[PDB]
Amino acid sequence: MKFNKQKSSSRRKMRKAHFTAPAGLRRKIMSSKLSKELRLKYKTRSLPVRKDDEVLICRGHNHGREGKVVKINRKRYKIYVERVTREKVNGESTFIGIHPSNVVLTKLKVDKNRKKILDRKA
Amino acid sequence: GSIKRFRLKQRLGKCRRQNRPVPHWYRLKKDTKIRYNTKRRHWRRTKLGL
Amino acid sequence: NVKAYELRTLKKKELLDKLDELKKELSGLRISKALGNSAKNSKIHGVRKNVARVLTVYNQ
Amino acid sequence: GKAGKGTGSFGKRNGKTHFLCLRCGKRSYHLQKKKCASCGYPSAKKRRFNWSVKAKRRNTTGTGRCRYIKTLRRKLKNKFTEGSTPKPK
RNA sequence: UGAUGUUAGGAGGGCAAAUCCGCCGAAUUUAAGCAUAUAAUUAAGCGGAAGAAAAGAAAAUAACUAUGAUUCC
RNA sequence: UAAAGCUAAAUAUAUGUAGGAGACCGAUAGCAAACAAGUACCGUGAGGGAAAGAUGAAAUAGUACUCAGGAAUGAGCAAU
RNA sequence: UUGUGUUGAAGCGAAAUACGUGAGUUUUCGUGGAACAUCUCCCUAGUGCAGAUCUUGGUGGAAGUAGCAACUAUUCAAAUGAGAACUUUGAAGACUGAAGUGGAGAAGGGUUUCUUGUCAACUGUGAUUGAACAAGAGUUAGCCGCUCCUAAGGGAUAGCU
RNA sequence: AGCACAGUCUUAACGAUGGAUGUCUUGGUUCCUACAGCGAUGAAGGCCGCAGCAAAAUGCGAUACGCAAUGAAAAUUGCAGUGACUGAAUCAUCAGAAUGCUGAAUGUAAACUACACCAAUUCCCUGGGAAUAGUGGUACUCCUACAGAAAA
Ligand SMILES: [Mg+2]
Ligand SMILES: [Mg+2]
Ligand SMILES: [Mg+2]
Ligand SMILES: [Mg+2]
Ligand SMILES: [Mg+2]
Ligand SMILES: [Mg+2]
Ligand SMILES: [Mg+2]
Ligand SMILES: [Mg+2]
Ligand SMILES: [Mg+2]
Ligand SMILES: [Mg+2]
Ligand SMILES: [Mg+2]
Ligand SMILES: [Mg+2]
Ligand SMILES: [Mg+2]
Ligand SMILES: [Mg+2]
Ligand SMILES: [Mg+2]
Ligand SMILES: [Mg+2]
Ligand SMILES: [Mg+2]
Ligand SMILES: [Mg+2]
Ligand SMILES: [Mg+2]
Ligand SMILES: [Mg+2]
Ligand SMILES: [Mg+2]
Ligand SMILES: [Mg+2]
Ligand SMILES: [Mg+2]
Ligand SMILES: [Mg+2]
Ligand SMILES: [Mg+2]
Ligand SMILES: [Mg+2]
Ligand SMILES: [Mg+2]
Ligand SMILES: [Mg+2]
Ligand SMILES: [Mg+2]
Ligand SMILES: [Mg+2]
Ligand SMILES: [Mg+2]
Ligand SMILES: [Mg+2]
Ligand SMILES: [Mg+2]
Ligand SMILES: [Mg+2]
Ligand SMILES: [Mg+2]
Ligand SMILES: [Mg+2]
Ligand SMILES: [Mg+2]
Ligand SMILES: [Mg+2]
Ligand SMILES: [Mg+2]
Ligand SMILES: [Zn+2]
Structure with missing residues (x-):
């Protein structure tokens, strides 16, 4: 690392650890940034992205569009938004994969689990 | 026999x-990438060796 | 779909009875699969797991 | 003559010297001596020699299932008392 | 005193060897040839242990104004 | 002061397991093996033993439609 | 130390009113799609190929050439099919000649057996055939055998080395 | 509508065949540090099985690509299916339960799923009931104790 010699800074090792991470670690890696308004109401800076949140697309060809998150794909490292779509060569409709770090989430969907986390973070 | x-x-x-x-x-x-089984055996060509 | 914590209060008698009827049901599903009735082929897994849970509780 | 020392006498080659070996599964059990040529089956030991490094590594400890040994790792760091469980709830 | 006992309670046997302990035991090679010599108290073979093993509290040096169990640099 | 016995530390570690690193190699190189590799295959047997990595940011974009042809396949005013 | 690059790197193909005695250096156009130098002075090495009946891989002339010859022998008409000298049906002419390409077993093989489908490669000419490829089937014993007995022999126990 | 002899060799441009070059790397290699055996309470190795549709490799054992418990915690997905709306879908940890036939292999054997002797054996309720040809033991050498017999 920087000063403690007990963990690595090898490209090989922790580039192998990113692509074979277990499914319980993949949700911490898949985290987004909180808006300015949500950063006063909550003392956290960033949260892992969940399903029924609302996000603003900030980077890419679809920058500036908003909408709701309809699916999370932990194997491919991607999320899906409700009206951002594509046509295949057949003519069937699909969803364009978005990377969660390209996004900032503007409205949350709280529950029993979330509260006991935001409370600790504040 | x-x-x-x-x-x-x-x-x-x-x-x-x-x-x-x-x-x-x-x-x-x-x-997945497995297209075909790479261990196929024909009775007249390769013997079981039992 | 049975749970382990709901079986810790049963007596050995009806624990064995429950295992017996689980086995009868799984045999029925196997027979119906041998005939080309594919409709209920997906229920086998749940019955198998239920049998395993009942055996676990009884042996402990 | 016609069953000469080459092609003609290869047609007389039915019969078997060796068959499958109980305790190692290779087709190396001399049916008439009654002794495996690979593991030395009828005897208690294993029949491995030091002049073959390659042979000594096809059938060593690491190259199988390790059924009981692999479950015995990390007890050196957990060191739980036998008969114990984590606290409930 | 020995045999006997499906009498009660227990032990040994097989795997693995990089480092360790005991036995057995060559020739290639060098000598510009070769037989003593060297290779070597080595390779192959057969046995026995531990996280280290083996050694170890003088029937030891020295010849000095004397030192003081073993191991290793 | 022989012909009986025990005993830590400072030493070693081409094995097994875990961790860290380099003026080292870069798919005919580096372990035989970067891939369902001691695998496929050869020998009655003791044994011998390979070849083989790369579309694209995204196939949650892997080629829809029309014409010719028995089909493969080709062509387009048509398509990612 | 001080520089190039999505306003296009390395590499590769063809070149130049270019420089040098020379090994080479530099530049244009095309392709390409992601990295590349340092000549300011130093350090370092698995550092320079025409050959070794050199190693591994790819490719030629010979060349549409050598050749596709044992086992007496084929013909007419029809069905199928995109397509029949070598698939099927009928009619002819012939062979094996009971020491048989007729029946039944052992060693060895292991699903090659049966029904259906069927042609990318194979079936050294064709092929709609097939022991090839795909889906599903098929082996029933008190009386047939093993299993029991002993043989030439093998392994062991006591003891001894 | 017409005109270039054919073959062989040389140069350019566009292609075919082949896989060199450059760039890439979840691999190798060496050194440094730390810990260290397993087995009759049945090891290492071998064989046979287990999924709804399932060949290999990977994982498991008649509870068989996984049970219970503990920490996280909504989905897993090729179809079919199962999931709170947190002992449940999935990931991690792993202490309880369970762990086929073998193998030193140890009743006699072994290119046999061959053949013995001894105790019938297991389960449910609190003395009654029920089930099953199913279960366990029996190598060799040795030590301590014991048992009687036999010899002196
Ligand atoms: Mg046979
Ligand atoms: Mg043959
Ligand atoms: Mg001869
Ligand atoms: Mg013989
Ligand atoms: Mg013994
Ligand atoms: Mg021993
Ligand atoms: Mg000499
Ligand atoms: Mg000489
Ligand atoms: Mg001489
Ligand atoms: Mg030796
Ligand atoms: Mg030991
Ligand atoms: Mg000691
Ligand atoms: Mg001592
Ligand atoms: Mg002494
Ligand atoms: Mg490294
Ligand atoms: Mg290689
Ligand atoms: Mg360069
Ligand atoms: Mg060189
Ligand atoms: Mg060269
Ligand atoms: Mg050359
Ligand atoms: Mg040639
Ligand atoms: Mg000719
Ligand atoms: Mg023919
Ligand atoms: Mg005749
Ligand atoms: Mg005749
Ligand atoms: Mg005759
Ligand atoms: Mg047939
Ligand atoms: Mg047929
Ligand atoms: Mg042909
Ligand atoms: Mg077939
Ligand atoms: Mg029968
Ligand atoms: Mg009979
Ligand atoms: Mg005899
Ligand atoms: Mg001309
Ligand atoms: Mg609970
Ligand atoms: Mg839980
Ligand atoms: Mg067991
Ligand atoms: Mg036995
Ligand atoms: Mg027999
Ligand atoms: Zn064997």
């Missing part, structure tokens, strides 16, 4: 079972 022992007959059946192709639905899977 026609005369056999139990163990040998069971091994013959086992060897016959493993000489079948990769299923078709398995190929529609993602995160």
